[PDB]
Chain length 215, copies 4
């Protein structure tokens, strides 16, 4: 039900500070290798007046190399798939709520994504597009209430130097009854490799690997 | 452009835990008395699977009795109107992001409302509908970066006794340039006066008054 | 067991950012009117390198005018007394933890206070002493798991204008079993009415009254 | 000023929910291997009524294996030493503030530690001693306003399954001016390897290694 090379199809509908927009993408990745790539195009709301970086981590933990000794919650959810919800709390009060319903059509994962960000101040690095990239991060996964949770505190590197921190809280919900894993981690590194000047076209990459902490 | 009896029309589109819904309402109130009333109808997504209480405070601080000695930011923004954004952080991690774009058509306020709540646990009081009502509250309003902010920390009473806390962070943005007020407060009391079995119809009231704290 | 005119004596021992200090005070107030005043003298750690305002709300909710229809948890805990614990979470990450053990010797309340604040940035308004005063505030008191809690969200006005927000979470523990009140509020207004150049001497006042919200 | 084998001596003074205690310890470790061990004795306030686990991470990032390509701030600050402050906010509202002043006498590190935790609920896992161990963690170190910061959010495994989350925010200040590192990580794994019934004697270990995350 999971092939070495899979395809990605997605549509994101959302708003930032009351500004609606829409973005669609097509991509591919190798789940057992924890790597993926995609091309994203703004469809509605362009040119986006906020930093594209706040959306990129919303654009699937099936693209994570899981070792044999750690139960793979996500690869166990297919073909039925799973959904996830996330609150991304930025340190200056900007809050982004996102949902993604992931299904499987043959060898293509299909994402239905909603994204709503609020309370981003005018002089902030998000509205002023002063973000550079997300730093590499380490997510922590643990079971709560029969469902899988995902917490990662990370930050964005800033233009004039410095970092802009954000707290992620994700709830992962399998559609069928799968086996739940133990407490573990997933290392991430998301990168926006190419883009045009106003980010209506974006090439985004991500490398992810699961581990059990210090060996 | 602001008389003692005004009307309200609204449409809310939103989702909770990835579950979409839509609600419309019609109402009226007395802005100079800080009182208002409305009838709400679910149009999509019914029956709502979450506590209706999380929606009511998203369903306009022009309906607040402001004394002369406190600058009225909201009555000053009309007829052009204003918009507001809000994050509502519940103590169990449930987060609701909401926006409201308020315009004026004659003597009727028109709301375009978006509402997005995520990470509400299945066993929580919201998904289990164990909330009774919002307690009376006191909002604190202050200026930051030329716009008016609104912080209020309050709670919902629970079915078996106890309180379920939530933190509100609201940004108020007037569409035209108006005068900024000083640090002040607004006392609130929101109430569901009537509803049917599945909350498809809701009659909602709110009482609001501004003050400057202990004299 | 409480008279209209009571006296206060206290000693606070603590540190901020790892630098120790100690302060003693003597004061007086009228519990049934919720007003009080005191004189504080620094005995250790002077001259204080941090804003004195971060300390003032630590320097007894018995000094609060309680209406007949609201159970007075604090005046009912005497002569045995009560203790309280409080975290004060400032929006830039500075955190102050405080405790107060309140006893009664005849007509004088005795406070044994501990105060520990950390992570105050050098460029922040606290370490740079850019604070002016606490704004009037409204605290909410509610029972949780048999204990009386007190949450209040307020801010400090800054020198060049602006506000520096802080989250208070207080736990009130009576020494004997006392009747618990219902959900209610307490309005506050604390003021430094006089001080010398380096705040070695401070005359501090507070006016507090409990109420039930709108109306 | 750094040898393969160093010794540790410390004294911690503190209070939890207002009840004072004091602990001293002696230990040894290998800074270049990022592992250390120590034996701790409760001297005042015993037997401790709270989970000992809340204290262990307060009982020195010099015991962290730093690779050549990452600046070692802690090792590059001796012999003068450094200090650190930290806020540990647990998900149920219990918050612990701690400071450690680290000096070097020959080949022995000396810690002067203050520890203050408040608002731990009686029915919570800390006051009921339902904690098992800290999970392995990944800390993130970054520069802000010329100072070294360390953020890690982790959790304690609880008796019978489950996790109790905590957010650490640490400020590292070398006494002398050293060299600030770039954004990097330090993996942690702390374990109580032996203790007597009421934790009057505790032998504590920690293994730590710095890295740069997924490349």
């Amino acid at each position: 039900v999971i092939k070495p090379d899979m395809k990605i199809k997605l549509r994101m509908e959302g708003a930032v500070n009351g500004h609606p927009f829409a973005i669609e993408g097509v991509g591919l990745g190798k789940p057992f290798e924890g790597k993926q790539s995609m091309d994203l195009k703004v469809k509605e709301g362009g040119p986006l007046p906020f930093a594209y970086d706040i959306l990129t981590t919303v654009f699937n933990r099936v693209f994570a190399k899981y070792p044999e000794n750690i139960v793979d919650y996500f690869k166990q959810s297919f073909p039925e798939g799973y959904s996830w919800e996330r609150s991304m709390n930025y340190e200056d009060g900007g809050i982004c709520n996102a949902t993604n319903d992931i299904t499987l059509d043959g060898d293509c994962y299909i994402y239905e994504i909603r994204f709503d960000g609020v309370n981003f101040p005018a002089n902030g690095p998000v509205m002023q597009k002063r973000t550079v990239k997300w730093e590499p991060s380490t997510e922590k996964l643990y079971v709560r209430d029969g469902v899988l949770k995902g917490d990662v505190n990370t930050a964005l590197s800033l233009e004039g130097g410095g970092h802009y921190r954000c707290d992620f809280k994700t709830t992962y919900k399998a559609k069928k009854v799968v086996q739940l894993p133990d407490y573990h981690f997933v290392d991430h590194h998301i990168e926006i490799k190419s883009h045009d000047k106003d980010y209506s076209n974006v090439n985004l990459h991500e490398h992810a690997e699961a581990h059990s902490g210090l060996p």
